[PDB]
């Protein structure tokens, strides 16, 4: 009965723990010891973007490192231009409570979603010249927390139902559903080759998926609170994860372990966003103490502080060419650092 | 270089045409209030898909009223998106024990880190069953709460004519039970407003109107150091 199944699960857990312990002999710190330090770094807010009424939950960059899109709870989806500080489009929304935003890689479509349980696709290339709804996707039973484009016809969505979904915009139906989590899944990120993706949830675990087969391959547990944001290492063989216990972690796919933890005593808030730079040497982290930190990914030392915001930091992003960093907060502003 | 000038001119025109309507929407947005309904005859109160939305006006003042629908029961993460709402209308029935669960929910929503500015309008529903049932001798209040045996009715109670002393004792005990948590924590930023309500009635919208008036007046008096 249930007791026998629990005993079998315990036996497999012990076997996996032993298999992980066998493969580990030396820590990453014992290797990255004699390498030169990165030194102090400084960044100045050489931009400021104004015009929202309420706070900001989500922003997303573009392919050309020029245009970004931002979502606000006054019911507005704004497309900006980082160079000349101009607004190109300002989409109204039928639902005021939005929580996520996404920009398609072809530059033709934008996505939106929130507490209405529906993912909406907005078209930007219209003969009439008006930006209207092109498709509404409604098959979820909980709020949408993150969505990302694959092509102009496929989308991946994440909800508070403990599920993830793969859609098909042309037809309007779900193709595959991923169900392994026990608590709300908060964020997800796509691998460079569009074959796999990792997700983090409110049960203090990260999971690895496959897009075609639809099965889960790896589960990682090293935290003590809820997972909030996640992102791949640019190589595609590691990823960094952030939680609400004032620590960040680095995980590897080849060894099924955690290599390094980032935490300092004067840090007692949570962590709301994470991102990697181009070369994998720096790790950015946004905090609830109204501050942004830059860590060295190979020594775990506080490489710099960015302090210019007056409220909680929610969204953070880095361009594809590694030029600038963009930060949003609950004061209805976006800043472009460098 | 003419093409660059044309592009810059087009972009500036688009920006201006957008900003005008942004300002109009600002003006329309600022003059509307927002309320979160949470909890219990919700249909009774409202009469008198994740979100159900209701719009109404009293004395040419406009309100938005938001009720959560198709959602789970984990409130940890979607309760933050109501940081700036002017009032949480909390409906609780006064009659497992539901009341102690309501107490724990109130304590959690009161002490949260992002909700230390929001105020709570409390509704204590089911007055008829609160009065009729207790006269039969069913000790619903003496056993669940063992502090009730030595509670004395306060000096300011003003019951409606014909009320039994036991009924008013029970009502004021419940109200004081809710009002113990509110005073201990909030240091002048946010308050709690109690209101007895009936299943058949027509005066709840006026109560919400007056309470919103009071909260906004209190905030303005607070910024100038008068209060």
């Amino acid at each position: 009965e249930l007791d026998q199944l629990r005993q079998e699960a315990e036996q497999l857990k012990n076997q996996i723990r032993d298999a992980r312990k066998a493969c580990a002999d030396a820590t990453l710190s014992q290797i990255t010891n004699n390498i030169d330090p990165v030194g102090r770094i400084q960044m100045r807010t050489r931009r400021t973007l104004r015009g929202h009424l309420a706070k900001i939950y989500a922003m997303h960059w573009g392919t050309d490192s020029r245009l970004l899109v931002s979502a606000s709870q006054d019911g507005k989806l704004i497309i900006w231009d980082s160079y000349t500080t101009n607004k190109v489009h300002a989409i109204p929304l039928r639902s005021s409570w939005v929580m996520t935003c996404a920009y398609a890689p072809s530059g033709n479509y934008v996505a939106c979603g929130g507490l209405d349980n529906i993912c909406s696709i907005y078209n930007l290339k219209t003969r009439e010249g008006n930006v209207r709804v092109s498709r509404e996707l409604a098959g979820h039973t909980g709020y949408l927390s993150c969505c990302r484009f694959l092509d102009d016809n496929q989308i991946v969505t994440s909800s508070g139902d403990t599920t993830c979904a793969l859609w098909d915009i042309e037809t309007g139906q779900q193709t595959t559903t991923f169900t392994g989590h026990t608590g709300d899944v908060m964020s997800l990120s796509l691998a460079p080759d569009t074959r796999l993706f990792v997700s983090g949830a409110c049960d203090a675990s990260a999971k690895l998926w496959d897009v075609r087969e639809g099965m889960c391959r790896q589960t990682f547990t090293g935290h003590e609170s809820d997972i909030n944001a996640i992102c791949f290492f640019p190589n595609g063989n590691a990823f960094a994860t952030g939680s609400d216990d004032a620590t960040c972690r680095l995980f590897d796919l080849r060894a099924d372990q955690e290599l390094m933890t980032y935490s300092h005593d004067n840090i007692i808030c949570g962590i709301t966003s994470v991102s990697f730079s181009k070369s994998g040497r720096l790790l950015l982290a946004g905090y609830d103490d109204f501050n942004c930190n830059v860590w060295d990914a190979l020594k775990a030392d506080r490489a710099g502080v960015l302090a210019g915001h007056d409220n909680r930091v929610s969204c953070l992003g880095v361009t594809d060419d590694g030029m600038a960093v963009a930060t949003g907060s609950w004061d209805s502003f976006l800043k472009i650092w460098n | 270089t003419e093409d660059q000038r044309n592009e810059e001119k087009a972009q500036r025109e688009a920006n201006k045409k957008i900003e005008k309507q942004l300002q109009k929407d600002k003006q329309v947005y600022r003059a509307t209030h927002r309320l979160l309904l949470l909890g219990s005859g919700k249909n009774t109160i409202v009469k008198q898909s994740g979100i159900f939305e209701t719009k109404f006006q009293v004395d040419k003042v406009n309100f938005h009223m938001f009720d959560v629908g198709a959602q789970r029961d984990e409130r940890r993460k979607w309760i933050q998106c109501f940081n700036d709402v002017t009032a949480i209308i909390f409906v609780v029935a006064s009659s497992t024990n539901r009341l102690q669960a309501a107490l724990k929910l109130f304590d959690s929503i009161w002490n949260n880190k992002w909700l230390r500015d929001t105020s709570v309008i409390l509704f204590l529903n089911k007055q008829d069953l609160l009065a009729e049932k207790v006269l039969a001798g069913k000790s619903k209040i003496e056993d669940y709460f063992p502090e009730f045996a030595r509670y004395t009715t306060p000096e300011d109670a003003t019951p409606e004519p014909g009320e039994d002393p036991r009924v008013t004792r029970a009502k004021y005990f419940i109200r004081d039970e809710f009002l113990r948590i509110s005073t201990a924590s909030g240091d002048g930023r946010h308050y709690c407003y109690p209101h007895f309500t009936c299943a058949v009635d027509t005066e709840n919208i006026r109560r919400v109107f007056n309470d919103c008036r009071d909260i906004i007046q209190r905030m303005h008096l607070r910024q100038y150091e008068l209060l």
Epitope: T182, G183 | I79, K104, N112
Partner: nanobody, 127 residues
Framework: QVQLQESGGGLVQPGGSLRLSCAAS????????MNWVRQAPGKGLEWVSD????????SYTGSVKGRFTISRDNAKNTLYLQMNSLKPEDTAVYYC?????????????????????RGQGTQVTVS
């Protein structure tokens, strides 16, 4: 990994006494606030009692006030519940729950189905 094990329990004669233990591993026991919950046959989940970080703020539900006691040990990472003078109404499964975040003053969902940081529980019976 966040693992919580419960020890003690079983059948106890009415008007008796019992002791229950909760051992936790996978997190810093001294940064979190802890509580107990129960779940009866045919009924939902219900709150019992709790303890703060240091051990100063102790609360109770009211239907067990003065009869049960709760205690906390940090050097051994173990939380205790002592039960006295039982009754036929006190038969249910008992769970040892932890609030979702450190250094906090409140926690929302410890009495909701499908919550992460909750143990398997123990069975106590009074007859």
């Amino acid at each position: 990994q966040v693992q919580l094990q419960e020890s003690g329990g079983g059948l106890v004669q009415p008007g008796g006494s019992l002791r229950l233990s909760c051992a936790a591993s996978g997190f810093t026991f001294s940064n979190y606030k802890m509580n107990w919950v129960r779940q009866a046959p045919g009924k939902g989940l219900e709150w019992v009692s709790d303890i703060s970080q240091s051990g100063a703020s102790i609360s109770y539900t009211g239907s067990v006030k003065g009869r049960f006691t709760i205690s906390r040990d940090n050097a051994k990472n173990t939380l205790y519940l002592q039960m006295n003078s039982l009754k036929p109404e006190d038969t249910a499964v008992y769970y040892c729950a932890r609030c979702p975040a450190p250094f906090t003053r409140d926690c929302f969902d410890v009495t909701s189905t499908t919550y992460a940081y909750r143990g398997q529980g123990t069975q106590v019976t009074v007859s």
